[PDB]
Point group: C3
Chain length 117, copies 3
Amino acid sequence: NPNEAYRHYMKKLSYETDIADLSIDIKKGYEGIIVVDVRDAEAYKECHIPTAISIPGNKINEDTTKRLSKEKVIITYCWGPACNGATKAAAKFAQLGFRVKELIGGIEYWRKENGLE
Amino acid sequence: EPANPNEAYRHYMKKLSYETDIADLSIDIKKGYEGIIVVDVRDAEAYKECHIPTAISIPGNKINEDTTKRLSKEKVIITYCWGPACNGATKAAAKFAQLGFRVKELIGGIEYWRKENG
Amino acid sequence: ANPNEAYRHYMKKLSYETDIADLSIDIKKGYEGIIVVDVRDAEAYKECHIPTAISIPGNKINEDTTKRLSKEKVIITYCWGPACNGATKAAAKFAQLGFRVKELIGGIEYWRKENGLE
């Protein structure tokens, strides 16, 4: 049913984001988002997406998100398509009342397009 | 905990109705099924360099009633972009569904397609 | 979407699919609460497959082939890779047979990169 499909595709787009869109935002210096790296601290220190902050997945709570503005949209990302980090983390953020959005592809897809930091 | 039998069944069934894979699409084209219209959402230049067989060119931010008036709403539209990192197919799928077409996005895009027919 | 809508979306998604890591940990611990099923052809399964997995080709899933399987366990289907539908299609048939199914996103392809099947 055309309408059912429209809502499906629309919602899907509201839950996830791709490398291109995220890439453009960071280059434009968008202040409306907060790119969060769900990987371990060590992985983040070796390299990570530009302007991204570090907040390991099983460490997401109100103590680590108190300084984050609920006025911005959180964008989580893990290693790649084989990881759940971004989705899991997205849940914890949405549960803490944040406007979360997972980055499908993670660092893996990002590397192929853009450069790490 | 995973999901309930019935809930799961509906989930997997719906998912299958929204997306298609390389194999299924490949079979349809091979035996030249006139019940689908494979549309390439990438830029015109990308489509001219190479594209999936029997696919037509209709750039994403160019999908409207002027470009879909010659397309039969009796057929199922199948959009596809570059690969998993692209939104083109999903975005385009929305515009088609909004124009009253029976749309279906191709998960994987050209990237996955290349790996299979070669 | 609104925080709550998102939470339910991500939660449900996690209940329908599983990743290499999680599945990997379960097998290594020798969990008896899951049944890893290979949806690929019999020949593909005999050449190599994920450890402790059983063989049940997709278009062969019915009550005759699932009568010996415990509905007390969670079925985990898997095909070749991201470009395949096997896992999703099979998942539907299992959920339809009243099983607590869960598809493995990535298939053998993703599993190889991490772990070393038998």
